[PDB]
RNA sequence: UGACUCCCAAGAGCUCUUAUCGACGGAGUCGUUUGGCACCUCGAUGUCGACUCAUCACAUCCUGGGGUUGAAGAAGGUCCCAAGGGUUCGGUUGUUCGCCGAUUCAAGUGGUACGUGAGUUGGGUUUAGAACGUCGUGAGACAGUUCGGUUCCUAUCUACCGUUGGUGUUAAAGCGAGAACUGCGAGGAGCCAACCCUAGUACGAGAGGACUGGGUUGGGCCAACCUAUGGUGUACCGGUUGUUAUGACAAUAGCAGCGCCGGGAAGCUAAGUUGGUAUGGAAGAACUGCUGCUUAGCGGGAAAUCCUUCUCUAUACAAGUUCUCGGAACAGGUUUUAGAACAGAACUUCGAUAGGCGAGAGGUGGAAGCACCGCGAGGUGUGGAGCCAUCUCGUACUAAACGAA
RNA sequence: UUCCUUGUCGCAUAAGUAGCGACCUGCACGAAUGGUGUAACGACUGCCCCGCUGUCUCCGACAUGGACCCAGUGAAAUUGA
């Protein structure tokens, strides 16, 4: 994974992403840069599989992360309850305009499966269970084709 | 994956579409038809190749890490020319930088070759080839491997114009050929 | 390093020439909102959001 | 990504085939060892050594681990592949409990 | 790498105890273990075969930098020791006669590639 | 003499 | 490179050369050498122009 | 004046002028020494030495090929040919120079504003302070000594190192594009030592001791690579000090500019690991011989010259060749082995390109809760436990063609 | 304070135009423009030794601010063409 430094240094960096994520939780959609955004997404997802987990270790280390008891509260009761079947993917990025004052590229992130959601979501589908990987020459053996014939 | 002249020029060879393309001169008596499929039993275990690819990148690179420089000291008065190139010419006389001086700019990415590389084993039944050494290249690009010029190889033992596997071949019989080494042990004669 | 010589209207059109703007190839408008935009713009959700 | 894909495939056949014809115990940080050595720079010569395991690393067939022992009154520490052929035989004496992974501090401390 | 400067101990019964070295005969970079060297006697015992202020031959038979081997192994002492050989005779770039006669200490398997046989054969354990 |  | 190594290797740049820095110096100078065709063998192409 | 070359040859060389030298005297070459002149610059051309970076000449220091010797062999002397590649680290000195020490195949002589300060320094000389010796009545002076003393500039043009954008190269769609090449031409690489066999052979009274030919090990330089080793590894694992907050317990979070300590995978890198330091052809330098008979013809002949191996190259304007496409190629988005912007390469929904999720490898080192032992700091079990910087595999849940575009 | 001069000898170093102690041939020392010493003191000027280190052999990785790129505002010396 390719970690942004976004011009910050290290504490004024997770203090930030910890804000954006604790405002995101709060208000169900927030408006900020791209690249902030690309940032907040991996951390917002990993603070839901935390409440999906429940466990007292995990409120633990949810409450070492985000900030406020409302956020705490939300996260380990009304996201577990509507992410409980689905995988990966709670948030969505959409980019929107460009910031006049400094061109900045914008973007909405929300969190996904809720009312008045910007894109309807696909339904929650648990995931199959692992598969025997072939190897890669038998995988080779058969990824070979011909043109198809148009001309 | 393929644009549409690329495609074109697979359909009317009659060819399946590949990746990466190049072209061998070789003589008249080593030409072979379009369609035959290359394995790695056209090299001998024990002789020697040539290994060419595109090298690593290390982008916009100054003198110190492109041509060895040594810059200038650290300590003692010196300012702001730590690594730094120094002097580019004399003066007046030639009054003009000479071509070919070595100044900074990108580094590497370019096609390199390295010879007399050693071809210790072979596996015929995954087409994978064991080559003593180091490759010019990233993990996961292409290398294009030809005989050696340098150390040339024995004529009465390579496969001409390549070795033709018979169609009525299995890969659940093919075992790994390794290079031979001999029977005088290099460490005890010492 | 100072300017030896005074850059003429020649030279300083010639090196201002490549940075002049271009159009742009494909551009998008919403039908319903109107919103003028580039591709990969997200203006309207439809209806029964 | 195949690449690193195949390279894994082959270090697993490789380990697997080493590990039925030798047998090469679990070597943790803090055991004692004894084991077999054959230098074949110096005409094969076959040698004991015996030593605290002070460091390892799991590599796959290029493990190694790093044996720090008082030879003649002077330090010596010498570093073994793990699945070298010139370790003829290794043996597991003592355990000694320890906090670390790697016994750094072995250098300074007096014992 | 042992270099111009490095003050190394001596492990023989030669007369002398600690020697500066000038360089390294065959090396830009300096001496590893094996390698022979030109030194300095810095000090030395009353009675011996050589006095303070000689300048010396001498094989590093301890170093403190790690030598790898042909198999992928290493090996790293914990100081830097010396066998001090003769230098009067210039004619012979080959194994030399070592000055002293015991020689103490662990001595490293590089002597027989390095043609340090008399060493090697003075020695008592090798590690 | 001559100086800078 | 010496007359006789450039006579082995290619002797119409010999004219070439000698006629090149006999023409003025001036911009009909590659014009006027387009015109003129050396030929190393007694076989033109041009045959059929009226010679 | 200096350096170098040549002419004559008394004499030295046991004999013998010219192997090696060479008195008394002459003829030149070069532009590096000491000088002469005062032609450019005083509305400024910054001066010694060192550092960094070099490049040219050959009057050659080493390596290469030869003639002669007062050359038995080894080691040599002298002269001719040869500029492909090299030509060390330190002590006193501001030093150039030079002396010394340890090496080396050798530690060349000169030019380039005694190369190089809009590339670095500032020890000396050469401003203002102060002192010693000497000179001067004195103010002061002294290529006599000594301590101290501001080194500016954002690159317009030429030059050079890299990367791109446009455009000429008739084609038949006023034609526009994607790949795969040939190489006119240009650049790069060019080393050396030690030991062993031939051989204790040739030669020599003996002591000594080869040519040629073939291997082995090292050093210097150049091109790459990251499996392992070492260093780093600022959003990984643990330990711990001061303080503040969550009321206290329990567990944490901020700050001490990673708070400080012990480890650390990927990535980068050398101190690490690999690869080269060739072969064949042509023409030929000093020299060396053959035919002929006065004019010449021919053969052998070096680390040197030109092709061959490596890299770039069709803007190579006589503008090259082959295959293919015609809603073709582009652009936009997700990225990366690539990267300053740009460009390249992978994917773009009949899709694993990125994120998430699950499993494993790898790192750290034994979580919380519970129970037992102890007055307590603490110790033991459940348990190779818990956690996650990376890497691989599975999976369209989210974003890439959600383009009913 | 000594031109000749890196004077000569000793200590010290692998090697010392330096440093210390001698010698006297003092170009051109010398007694309140003070002579010879001197415990303590010095951001004064030399020399030697220990500890320590990227000053160096020989450089590498990482971290913050510029440099790079996009959107606003927007100088300077210089200039016969
Ligand atoms: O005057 C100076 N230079 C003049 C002209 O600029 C000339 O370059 C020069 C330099 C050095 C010099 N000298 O060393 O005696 C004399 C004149 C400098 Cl002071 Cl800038
Ligand atoms: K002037
Ligand atoms: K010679
Ligand atoms: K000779
Ligand atoms: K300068
Ligand atoms: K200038
Ligand atoms: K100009
Ligand atoms: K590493
Ligand atoms: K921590
Ligand atoms: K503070
Ligand atoms: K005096
Ligand atoms: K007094
Ligand atoms: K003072
Ligand atoms: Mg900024
Ligand atoms: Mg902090
Ligand atoms: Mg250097
Ligand atoms: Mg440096
Ligand atoms: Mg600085
Ligand atoms: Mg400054
Ligand atoms: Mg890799
Ligand atoms: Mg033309
Ligand atoms: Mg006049
Ligand atoms: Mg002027
Ligand atoms: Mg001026
Ligand atoms: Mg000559
Ligand atoms: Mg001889
Ligand atoms: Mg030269
Ligand atoms: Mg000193
Ligand atoms: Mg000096
Ligand atoms: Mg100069
Ligand atoms: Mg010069
Ligand atoms: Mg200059
Ligand atoms: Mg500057
Ligand atoms: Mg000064
Ligand atoms: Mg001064
Ligand atoms: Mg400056
Ligand atoms: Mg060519
Ligand atoms: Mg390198
Ligand atoms: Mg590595
Ligand atoms: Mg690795
Ligand atoms: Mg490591
Ligand atoms: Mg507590
Ligand atoms: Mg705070
Ligand atoms: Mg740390
Ligand atoms: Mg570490
Ligand atoms: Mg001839
Ligand atoms: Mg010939
Ligand atoms: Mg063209
Ligand atoms: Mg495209
Ligand atoms: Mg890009
Ligand atoms: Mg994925
Ligand atoms: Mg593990
Ligand atoms: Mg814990
Ligand atoms: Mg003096
Ligand atoms: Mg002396
Ligand atoms: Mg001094
Ligand atoms: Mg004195
Ligand atoms: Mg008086
Ligand atoms: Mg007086
Ligand atoms: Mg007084
Ligand atoms: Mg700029
Ligand atoms: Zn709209």
Redesign the interface.
Known sequence: TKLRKLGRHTGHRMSMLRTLVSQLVKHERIETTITKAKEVRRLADNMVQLGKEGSLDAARRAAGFVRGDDVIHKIFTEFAYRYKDRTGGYTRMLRTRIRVGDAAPMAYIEFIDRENELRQSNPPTPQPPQRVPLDPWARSRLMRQYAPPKE | HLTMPELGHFRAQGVPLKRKLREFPVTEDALLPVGTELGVRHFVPGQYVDVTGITRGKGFQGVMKRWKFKGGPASHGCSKAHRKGGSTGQRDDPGKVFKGRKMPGHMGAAQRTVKNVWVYKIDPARNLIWVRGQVPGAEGNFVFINDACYKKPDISKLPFPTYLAPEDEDPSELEPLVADLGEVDPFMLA | AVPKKKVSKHKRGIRNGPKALKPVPVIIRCRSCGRVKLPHFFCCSGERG | KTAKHIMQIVDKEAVEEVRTRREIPEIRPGYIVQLKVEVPENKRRVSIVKGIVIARRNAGLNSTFRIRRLVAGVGVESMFPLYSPNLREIKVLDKKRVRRAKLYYLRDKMN | FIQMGTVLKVVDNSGAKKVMCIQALKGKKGARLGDTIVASVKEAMPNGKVKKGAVVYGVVV?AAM?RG???????????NAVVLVDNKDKKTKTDRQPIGTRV???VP??L??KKHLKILALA???? | GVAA | RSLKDQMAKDPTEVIRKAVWRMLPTNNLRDDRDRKLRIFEGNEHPFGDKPL
């Open positions: 301890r790690q081997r042909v198999d992928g192994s290493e090996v790293r002492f914990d100081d103490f200490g662990p398997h590089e027989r590639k008592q354990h090798i590690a």
